[PDB]
């Protein structure tokens, strides 16, 4: 029963991916009305099954806790873009299409119905098939959203806000996959860590608002790299310091999900860093921006690796200074993970400091790379904070 | 212990993929010496671990049976290209590089050592890590080979033969993955079916030699499409006829591997057919080639679906005419699967009949699509023949 649902999802996803990639990367003309028509169709049956599932279940392990919160946060963002889309598109109908208008309406309906369904708590065969088709619907929306940014380059304001379709589809797919598996299942502070973390959070918040929400001057590029190098460098030292603390000091099983999620979600920033490193080593003239870009890219790999080691060891384990110091290390890393969570979440994907990478790969290729890998940093930062909350609670 | 090996493989693979994709799709210059240097490096540790594994095991479930045969068949092809590469590259050294020569030598060493290792039959942690790194080495070679064809467009003859690196890396990765999982494991003929299958095999063999080994005339394009439509159309009718035979007529468990492989490997031809259909519906003028291309693409989807249904039902089950007719249906499908196995195996990937798809997507994009999806048709055709051999044996 499980294999039938998996095969249905992949076959549906493959057909959707071919239509999305074929209609955008062809040489005759770029097609979006058919892509919108396909996505509007896929959400319809996905919404219909969920609506049927909700009605048939009203009379009648869970994954990360932060999944529900991130799903609602990005679902609301996906609702705002749809509301702005219909308002602008319904202003004039003689120049546009019906799908240009039915698609945001159906997506808004799909987001509302799916977000409520995933938030709340027998025919297992239909349930698995419906969930897996819903997973394929979200992954098709994720791929179309990624391709949409790649091919790029009052009207309800100016559509300055960008569609958060990549991030919501990631959270929805994870929640649907988790639920699909479960179908038929049988004080103490030195006043030095939190203070430093709060200062870095305040400084980074100013940088994000000043330069990252939206051509920028040289000082702006220096400020952004200076903060990130300091922020990532401090966690690298702090996480390393925490690891050697445990060195001076089994029966519980290995938390496979925690280790897989921490290392798995760190792959997104690894790919961005690896792409950036070769884009600096080659192309990026030897200049201040190249040195800052190379150090920042290298520090992301170091920060992700050494923070993961500290978190994994601390969870598995479960001198008066020993406990007091670990509270600040957990708290400093917790605050430093929150501040750099906003950049992959609410920052312009291509970024302004990525001139070297954009010149090396081109805007179309680099935009696709960041739009694929940066949203996975949202998963890592959210899971690191929750894991550090757990670590800080115990010891 | 299993998760550590998986994370090591993906992290190694991601670094290799970034170097391969970054060095070829950038806008400054296309780099291949570094890509060759990286691949030559990865095979070195992969070969060293295998060599160490073989020596340490001399003193001391299995997957599809056809995997070993296909691995040797394509491993030998990968040896021939390496022998021709060194011979041509060693003719002149003042204009070439050392990696241009060490890379084919190391690949030939890597292929010889790996093929013998996979053919033959405690530190499970090292064994899993070494196998998973070897899997990442082959997948990196597979991706570089696919990118190499995509970016395209006596010298030891004329290098007319193309590197069979895509097909061998697929067989090697499957065998390594299968072995990684198992580490620490606790007559009767109507004289109408075989005759038709033999005739189709003979006709298709002539078509493959005449036009598919290597600009072609209109008659050549008509002949190729005529045979494929007839061949795929006949299996569609024959497989459907076999399915309704069983309709006129449990305790054994579902053969998940057989169902997954049959449906999973059919995805490659589905993607090619789906890409072809939208490349005809749009672009391909309404002409004879468009009609033949559309029918052939649609018949591949029908042939794969209806053949899979007949094979899956027949295996699970395990009137005198009832048994006699199924022998011919199994034998006709067996011979018809062999003849269309050579096209994805020994035929020019872009093909001569793919002018409509090439014009729609461009040579670079279409070559990547066929070089990714067509080799998976080799897995399906080989598994269909073995499954039909099993079906013909029982009933």
Author numbering:
A (entry chain A), B (entry chain B): 28 to 87, 97 to 157, 164 to 195, 237 to 269, 287 to 314, 320 to 354, 361 to 429, 487 to 563
Task: Give the exact sentences the study uses for this entry.
The otopetrin (OTOP) proteins were recently characterized as extracellular proton-activated proton channels. Several recent OTOP channel structures demonstrated that the channels form a dimer with each subunit adopting a double-barrel architecture. In this study, we performed structural and functional characterization of the Caenorhabditis elegans OTOP8 (CeOTOP8) and mouse OTOP2 (mOTOP2) and illuminated a set of conformational changes related to the proton-conducting process in OTOP. Combining the structural information from both channels, we propose a working model describing the multi-step conformational changes during the proton conducting process.
In these mutations, one or two interfacial residues on TM1 or TM9 are replaced by tryptophan. No channel activity was observed in three single mutants, including L30W, V370W, and M374W. The lack of channel activity in these mutants are not caused by low expression in HEK cells or the disruption of their dimerization, as all three loss-of-function mutants were expressed at an even higher level than the wild-type channel and all can be purified as a stable dimer. It is interesting to note that those functional mutations are largely clustered at the extracellular half of the interface whereas the three loss-of-function mutations are all positioned near the intracellular end of the interface.
